Design a protein around this ligand. Structure first.
Ligand SMILES: [Ca+2]
Ligand SMILES: [Ca+2]
Length: 312
């Protein structure tokens, strides 16, 4: 497997559990620090990083009824400049740039208690596909599916429904949606970290996925595996293989990566493209820092980069 070694440039440092890199509709960059703790208890943070300097500002330190959150993944909304955040303790949150937030669901569409979330991906129809590797949200004692198969997948729909679309995953992690050239959502990709597998489903409609399949295989037997993921404009899927020192690049059809990206660290965690550029910001857990490097092309446009009232 061909490996490229592009130049990684430091962006910012000291972000405990540096995760969920995201750009909003204004080009502002954000990162979540899930692993920040206060006297042993969760106290995760949502930060805005000035790219010109690397200076950090925590806009939100989410807590519900005394229970601190573990914000781990992000997606920027389209119709409003707000961030949808997957929280390992609080479920799904919507955070405003002013730092205020709202817990989205205590329970799902079926009345079952919500599970902690880790990452999410907006399809072009506005539906949010979310991974839930943790057990029940706070106040429930924290648990996570790193060993046992209790990780679930949800689809938070445009009509406000938190629908569990699948269960029994061993730490569902990264997630991405593949679109047809005309913008129609047709395939969901979900990373199952420890098993070294990438799973795929056919998206038949909002919250409707079928034909579960082992779509791709992650290199290595190291502890870790597929974490964050995203598509480039040609639909190649770049996946952070935590513990491998590489970001795998899968072609449109999956299988084995067709190329690997060597990182100057062992734990790449998540990534995100800077809109309209080949620049990919990468978070890692070795130094708890954020970096950025140049990929071969622009990333696939995120939902926030699409237009509600566009003509073409
Ligand atoms: Ca993750
Ligand atoms: Ca991303």
């Amino acid at each position: 497997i061909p490996v490229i070694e592009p130049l990684f440039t430091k962006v910012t440092e000291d972000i405990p559990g540096a995760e969920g890199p995201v750009f909003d509709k204004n080009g502002d960059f954000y990162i979540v620090a899930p692993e920040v703790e206060v006297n042993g208890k969760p106290a995760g943070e949502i930060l805005r990083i000035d790219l010109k300097t690397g200076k950090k500002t925590v806009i939100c330190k989410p807590e519900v009824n005394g229970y601190g959150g573990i914000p781990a993944g992000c997606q920027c909304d389209r119709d409003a400049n707000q961030l949808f955040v997957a929280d390992m303790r609080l479920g799904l949150l919507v955070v405003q740039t002013d730092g205020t937030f709202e817990e989205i669901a205590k329970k799902d569409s079926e009345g079952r208690r919500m599970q902690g979330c880790n990452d999410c991906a907006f399809d072009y129809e506005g539906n949010l596909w979310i991974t839930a590797p943790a057990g029940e949200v706070a106040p429930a004692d924290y648990t996570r599916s790193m060993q046992e198969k209790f990780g679930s997948i949800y689809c938070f729909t445009t009509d406000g429904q938190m629908i569990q679309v699948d269960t029994a995953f061993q730490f569902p992690n990264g997630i991405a949606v593949r679109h047809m050239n005309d913008g129609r959502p047709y395939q969901l990709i979900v990373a199952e970290t420890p098993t070294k597998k990438l799973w795929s489903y056919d998206i038949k409609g909002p919250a409707k996925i079928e034909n579960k399949k082992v779509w791709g295989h992650i290199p290595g037997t190291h502890e870790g595996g597929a974490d964050g993921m995203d598509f480039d404009e040609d639909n190649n899927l770049l996946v952070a293989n935590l513990g491998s020192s590489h970001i795998e690049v899968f072609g449109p059809d999956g299988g084995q990566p067709k190329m690997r990206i060597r990182c100057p660290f062992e734990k790449p965690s998540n990534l995100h493209f800077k809109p309209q550029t080949k620049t990919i910001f990468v978070t890692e857990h070795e130094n708890n820092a954020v970096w950025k490097f140049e990929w071969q092309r622009n990333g696939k446009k995120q939902y926030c980069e699409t237009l509600k009232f566009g003509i073409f």
